[PDB]
Amino acid sequence: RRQLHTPGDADPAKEALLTWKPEMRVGQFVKNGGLAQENRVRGHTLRATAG
Amino acid sequence: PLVLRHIAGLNGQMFGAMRSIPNSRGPYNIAQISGVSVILGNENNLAPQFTLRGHDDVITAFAMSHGGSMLATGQKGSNSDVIVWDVAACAPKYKFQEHDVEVATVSFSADDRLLLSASCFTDAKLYVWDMATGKIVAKHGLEPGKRITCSAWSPALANGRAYTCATAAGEELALWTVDPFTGMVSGQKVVLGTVRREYTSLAFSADGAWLYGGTTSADVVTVNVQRASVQMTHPVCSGGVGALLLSPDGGGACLVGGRDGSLSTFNAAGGAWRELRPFAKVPGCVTSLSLSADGGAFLVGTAQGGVYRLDRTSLQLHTISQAQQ
Amino acid sequence: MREIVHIQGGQCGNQIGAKFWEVVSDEHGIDPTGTYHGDSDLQLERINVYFNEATGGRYVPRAILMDLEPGTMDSVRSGPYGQIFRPDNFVFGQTGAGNNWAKGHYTEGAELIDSVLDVVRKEAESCDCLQGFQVCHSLGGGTGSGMGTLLISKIREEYPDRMMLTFSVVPSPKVSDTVVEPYNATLSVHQLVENADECMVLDNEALYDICFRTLKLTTPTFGDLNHLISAVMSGITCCLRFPGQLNADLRKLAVNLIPFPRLHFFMVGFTPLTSRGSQQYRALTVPELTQQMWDAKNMMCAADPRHGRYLTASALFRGRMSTKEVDEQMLNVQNKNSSYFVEWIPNNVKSSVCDIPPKGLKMSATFIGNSTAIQEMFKRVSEQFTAMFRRKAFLHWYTGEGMDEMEFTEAESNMNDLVSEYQQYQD
Numbered sequence: 001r002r003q004l005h006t007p008g009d010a011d012p013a014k015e016a017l018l019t020w021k022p023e024m025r026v027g028q029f030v031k032n033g034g035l036a037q038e039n040r041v042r043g044h045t046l047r048a049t050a051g
Numbered sequence: 052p053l054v055l056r057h058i059a060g061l062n063g064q065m066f067g068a069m070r071s072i073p074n075s076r077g078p079y080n081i082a083q084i085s086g087v088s089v090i091l092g093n094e095n096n097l098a099p100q101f102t103l104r105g106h107d108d109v110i111t112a113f114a115m116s117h118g119g120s121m122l123a124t125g126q127k128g129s130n131s132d133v134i135v136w137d138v139a140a141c142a143p144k145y146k147f148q149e150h151d152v153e154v155a156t157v158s159f160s161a162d163d164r165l166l167l168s169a170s171c172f173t174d175a176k177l178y179v180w181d182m183a184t185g186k187i188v189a190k191h192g193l194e195p196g197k198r199i200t201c202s203a204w205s206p207a208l209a210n211g212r213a214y215t216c217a218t219a220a221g222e223e224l225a226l227w228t229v230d231p232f233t234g235m236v237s238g239q240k241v242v243l244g245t246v247r248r249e250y251t252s253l254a255f256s257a258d259g260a261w262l263y264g265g266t267t268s269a270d271v272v273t274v275n276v277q278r279a280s281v282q283m284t285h286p287v288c289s290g291g292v293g294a295l296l297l298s299p300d301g302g303g304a305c306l307v308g309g310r311d312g313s314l315s316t317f318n319a320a321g322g323a324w325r326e327l328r329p330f331a332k333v334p335g336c337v338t339s340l341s342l343s344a345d346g347g348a349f350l351v352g353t354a355q356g357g358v359y360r361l362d363r364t365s366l367q368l369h370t371i372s373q374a375q376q
Numbered sequence: 377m378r379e380i381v382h383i384q385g386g387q388c389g390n391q392i393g394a395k396f397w398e399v400v401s402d403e404h405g406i407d408p409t410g411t412y413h414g415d416s417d418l419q420l421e422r423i424n425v426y427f428n429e430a431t432g433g434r435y436v437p438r439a440i441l442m443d444l445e446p447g448t449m450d451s452v453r454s455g456p457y458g459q460i461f462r463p464d465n466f467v468f469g470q471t472g473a474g475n476n477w478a479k480g481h482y483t484e485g486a487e488l489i490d491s492v493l494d495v496v497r498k499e500a501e502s503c504d505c506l507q508g509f510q511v512c513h514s515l516g517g518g519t520g521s522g523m524g525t526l527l528i529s530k531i532r533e534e535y536p537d538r539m540m541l542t543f544s545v546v547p548s549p550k551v552s553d554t555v556v557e558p559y560n561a562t563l564s565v566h567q568l569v570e571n572a573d574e575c576m577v578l579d580n581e582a583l584y585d586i587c588f589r590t591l592k593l594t595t596p597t598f599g600d601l602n603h604l605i606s607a608v609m610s611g612i613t614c615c616l617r618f619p620g621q622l623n624a625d626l627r628k629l630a631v632n633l634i635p636f637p638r639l640h641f642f643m644v645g646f647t648p649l650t651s652r653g654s655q656q657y658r659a660l661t662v663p664e665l666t667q668q669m670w671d672a673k674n675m676m677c678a679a680d681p682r683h684g685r686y687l688t689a690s691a692l693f694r695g696r697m698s699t700k701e702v703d704e705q706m707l708n709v710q711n712k713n714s715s716y717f718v719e720w721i722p723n724n725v726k727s728s729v730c731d732i733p734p735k736g737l738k739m740s741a742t743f744i745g746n747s748t749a750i751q752e753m754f755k756r757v758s759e760q761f762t763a764m765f766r767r768k769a770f771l772h773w774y775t776g777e778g779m780d781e782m783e784f785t786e787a788e789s790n791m792n793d794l795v796s797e798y799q800q801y802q803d
């Protein structure tokens with residue numbers, strides 16, 4: 001069959017799972033005077049799920 | 052008189068007290084802040100030069116031109132004045148005595164034409180000076196009882212003059228537009244959403260649309276100046292960003308120095324997830340950072356009175372001069 | 377070997393604690409990252425009290441942050457000293473209590489009070505010997521009141537022999553912010569009587585009097601009120617973190633203050649408050665600190681100490697002082713004003729001296745006073761309640777999440793008994 005890349009591997013945090021790298025850091029962002037908040041690729045579902 | 056041997060001493064309390072003249076052809080390479088005067092000297096082989104005396108009281112504001120031809124320094128005492136020295140001849144080219152209590156901050160523009168000396172907290176009279184003559188260009192009233200930590204200018208210019216920015220002692224960060232048309236300065240506070248950090252050292256980007264301010268909270272607050280807003284913050288180093296200076300590589304990189312003596316590289320266009328490579332280490336608590344000459348050496352100044360030279364390709368440590376506090 | 381677990385609840389509790397962790401971290405030399413950078417060796421002697429040692433030398437606070445609205449969890453970590461806190465401790469809801477005591481305590485508590493206990497159980501297990509728990513919240517809203525008292529109810533049934541510090545702000549006499557504020561306080565004080573081993577009483581409009589008159593700040597920031605509270609919350613535990621001439625832990629403060637179990641509400645003042653324009657001219661001495669200590673306006677409560685007698689008081693001195701000077705000054709204020717102190721308790725004021733002053737001051741003192749004058753505050757909250765409850769105004773919301781009117785009537789059962797039990801010692 002035709003080989004395709006797995007689409008789930010695009011997450012930067014998943015590039016090395018089960019390794020202890022304490023110097024990995026999390027960024028934040030501000031939206032025009034709004035509340036500064038954590039920047040993830042999909043942080044909304046981690047924050048408040050869906051529905 | 053009596054012959055003077057090597058003189059040592061730097062005020063580690065204030066930020067950016069050791070900075071290097073970008074042109075090393077002269078006998079002077081390094082400038083450091085003492086109590087009453089400054090020390091101009093050379094980097095490698097310690098043969099110090101004249102201490103530019105002439106201040107009545109303790110120095111608490113330092114700046115130098117990006118071209119290396121002019122230096123500016125204020126004092127804290129009752130007879131408060133900010134004076135600009137020339138480096139070609141050890142002489143004070145300019146004197147300005149209109150601040151009453153103390154000088155807050157002093158900065159030069161991207162080109163050597165403009166001075167910002169927004170410097171008081173009681174009367175708070177923001178000044179913008181020119182370097183062609185010793186006369187005022189722009190005047191403003193800042194705030195009663197507010198302290199200004201650090202100020203800088205943008206490399207983006209329109210009609211031959213630049214626009215500056217300053218940090219207050221608290222959260223707020225004010226952007227100022229100065230013009231040659233009528234000398235009317237326009238100020239705007241940045242819309243800090245919830246980022247309320249104490250700003251340690253700010254500097255603009257290469258394009259000038261963004262300004263990066265390293266804070267005490269070990270992160271770089273990015274401010275876009277066309278919208279006058281805060282965009283994102285990125286934590287760099289395990290200590291607060293005492294010093295911040297744009298990288299000479301030409302990209303969107305910026306060299307920063309943490310509280311733990313780590314000189315790291317911060318990329319503006321980067322992912323949310325970042326890995327903090329130390330990029331060599333400095334034993335002291337780094338508060339000042341500069342580029343010495345064409346040899347690729349960064350001069351870093353610490354709160355413990357240590358000045359260190361760190362070359363690139365390869366990376367080696369060479370201590371220069373220590374000083375007790 | 378004694379440690380304190382800190383819990384912050386609501387909009388008011390999170391901002392007070394963030395300003396508290398702003399102040400208590402710098403006096404031990406911990407930067408916003410967690411690395412020690414202090415210039416003294418005594419700062420690292422007691423780091424365990426408020427910080428957990430981690431890998432790489434980072435120190436993480438023993439702080440649990442709770443709220444029902446996710447906006448405040450942006451408000452804590454994005455401010456100064458916001459990155460010290462553990463992201464696992466950032467436990468929060470999604471809808472917000474919305475100033476309802478019923479929502480915080482009955483409906484929205486049940487999906488979150490299980491989760492906040494798992495963080496507290498994890499933090500209590502990691503400790504070796506808990507001195508006590510310390511919470512800071514508001515009695516005006518619903519997130520820090522209904523859910524805040526719910527944790528206090530569920531933590532005393534698990535740890536009954538440990539102390540419970542509550543730093544709770546109350547409704548104000550003059551001007552307020554929430555309409556249903558008497559409803560939220562009367563329910564919360566009803567819970568706070570039996571479980572909280574000691575309570576600290578705060579209100580914003582006493583701090584407004586302190587900021588405008590003593591500190592003389594022209595336009596005080598909303599966080600400038602928090603710095604007065606934060607200096608206190610560091611001052612109660614000042615003897616724990618540092619050595620001193622007279623050692624007084626949280627238990628010795630507790631066992632000396634309360635004569636009877638139900639009189640655990642205290643009013644607190646902070647002594648060395650001087651404006652920056654006159655800080656050069658002020659000489660900081662023990663007679664100077666004590667004179668500012670016992671002043672009515674220096675208290676952080678709306679209750680005037682002149683109205684009701686001081687049942688028992690305590691002072692926590694920080695800095696280099698003389699034991700004879702401190703002891704003879706506390707005897708002077710009792711003998712000069714004996715009508716304002718209770719007669720059947722000799723030696724009302726118990727003082728403690730710590731040899732490490734706070735940053736920027738060579739001498740400091742935090743004053744705790746248990747007096748019957750605070751019954752004027754609780755009666756003032758109660759008289760606002762009986763006006764609204766007699767017509768069942770703003771009650772269809774509270775009964776919406778499950779509680780009945782019987783719990784409202786029982787709220788005034790213990791509130792009016794509390795003010796009557798305070799009253800029997802004033803005469």
Ligand SMILES: Nc1nc2c(ncn2[C@@H]2O[C@H](COP(=O)(O)OP(=O)(O)O)[C@@H](O)[C@H]2O)c(=O)[nH]1
Pocket residue numbers: 385386387388389391392473474475514516517518519520521545552553554580598599601602
């Ligand atoms: N001193 C002080 N008071 C605060 C702070 N934040 C909120 N408050 C007070 O808390 C009262 C309302 O609290 P609220 O936000 O309703 O609490 P919650 O909704 O239960 O989380 C207001 O009257 C404010 O005066 C703070 O940071 N410091």
